[model samples]
Target: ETRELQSLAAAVVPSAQTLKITDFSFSDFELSDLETALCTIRMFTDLNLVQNFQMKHEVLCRWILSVKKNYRKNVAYHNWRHAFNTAQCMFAALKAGKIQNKLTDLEILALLIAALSHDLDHPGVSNQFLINTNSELALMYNDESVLEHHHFDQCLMILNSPGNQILSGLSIEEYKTTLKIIKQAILATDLALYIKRRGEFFELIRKNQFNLEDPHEKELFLAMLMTACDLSAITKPWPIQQRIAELVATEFFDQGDRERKELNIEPTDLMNREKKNKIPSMQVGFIDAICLQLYEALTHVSEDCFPLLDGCRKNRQKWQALAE
Candidate 1:
């Protein structure tokens, strides 16, 4: 662990300290993969994971390396870069959005780890695609959030591995609690789960029943934050987001190609290569259907999160203009 951990530490940047990544417009793409690793470490430091959790710095860096490497390198979008960006979004929401004041340190810790590990080992395929094809994973998870469940399992595996014991400092009860919350945080990335819980979250907001002290309410909030971080690419600046959409579209179209060739079926408009021109309109539909509502609901809880909603609205407008 010593030799490997030392080598890993050197792979990170001199420091990400100069960047104002707490700003909503922060984009980690400007940093190389090495600097991004350092940026993540900076985020952990900024969040006080070391002192608050009594985490060993060496073990934490090793765990970060393990977690980062566990992400499949070949995928178009769901690679380590995407997971890193998601963690960045979560960091922004907690810091820039100022929601950290309402939450405990443990919850924040679980959230940061979960955001980085959410899409671990992602196959770059949708759950529906897995189910329709009767993939072994779908059978294993009973077609219920197969990817998310697998991701959680993978996250657990990395954490339990020898040198990757980032959470070793926690008590048994604290460990168990964090793992449970982490599971929910990862599984909540599933769009199905988001749709299932979205209304409940809205109701909690509408009724003024949202309270961080309530476990159920807090879980919902954590889950919503998961989606916000996961879908935060939509909230980035146009130059950044425009490229991600292309990458995402390419992956979706690849799946569509498989469906057409293997399943002997037509792909959905959004996934079909022939329907590429519809992307602008579809982007608007995506914001309206998911991003806008989620960000708006978050704003009700903390107006500081308005940057997310504001960026989302701006992108929606840009998409709308192109749609016309």
Candidate 2:
């Protein structure tokens, strides 16, 4: 397993010697900014942290610090830091919409914490595993959104423990509200939710509703945006885009290998087979879609994001060339 893991890492980024949570701290501009941005999001949201929320933050910090301390050296593609990074991207999206005022500081913080802990122990496998193998996670989630659903329940279970009661201060009503927002946001990350949420976002764009000044509406918008940004490498600088392409390709191939060994299935490389990927043409289409979404959204934010948008399109072509 160790050898396979190293080979996979190298295949994705030739420079990757071993995959570690701390290594994510310095991957490049977008990733570094993602770290800073998440911290900022937490700071902004802490105003609402109830005693329970504060307790949750402590557990979250310890989990993160553990990554920094021992460096779990084996989270494969999506580590806890990726979760942190994803949360940052979501918060940034919400901020970009300029709708922070609607959320109680606590609600925002809960959303961020949920994003940060959504993939505590990913096991380097896909939702298919939990389903096909009838894994514990599959059982827990009844095989629906197999992995994502499990992560949410398990995470909440952890937080509910006496040692962790992060939201203990909330009245039963407030606790449910906080959990609903956080759960909704995280579940929005599920593959099944992609098309539905994406269409809503596009509709919002078409309707000129992209300028969400309302935090409540913006929370949903941010959920979609975070999902976009979590998979937004294609929209990043070219080098980073290339790196993620490699990582994603490595993951797909590894999945292919897994299928061949375990189920006697053939690998994918053909046209139709590409559809099976969660990120398929994801890099290609995300930026393409971003061009349209942001073009309209541009009427709203700073001009700075233009370059990032261009990089996304350019990077897609670069990967396409290599793919051929």
Q: Rate the local accuracy (lDDT) of all candidates.
A: 0.88, 0.53
Tens-digit per-residue lDDT, 1-324, candidate 2: 234223322332211222121221224334442243335334333334434345444443433333222212364456654565565444544454333454556566666666666665666567876587677778877777776776677667665755346566667987887887777767767756765566666666667676556765566665654465466555556666567666656656666667678877675552113454544455555556544454334323434335434555566686556545
Q: Estimate each model's TM-score.
A: 0.95, 0.68
What's every prediction's RMSD, in angstroms?
A: 1.8, 8.7
Q: Which of the numbered candidates is closest to the native, going by highest TM-score?
A: 1
Worst 10 residues of 1 by lDDT: 8-17
What TM-score does model 2 achieve against the real structure? 0.68
TM-score of 1: 0.95
Q: Top model by lDDT, which number?
A: 1
| Residue 59 lDDT in candidate 2 | 43
Could you tell me how far off, in angstroms, the CA of residue 309 lies in candidate 2 after the best superposition? Answer: 3.3
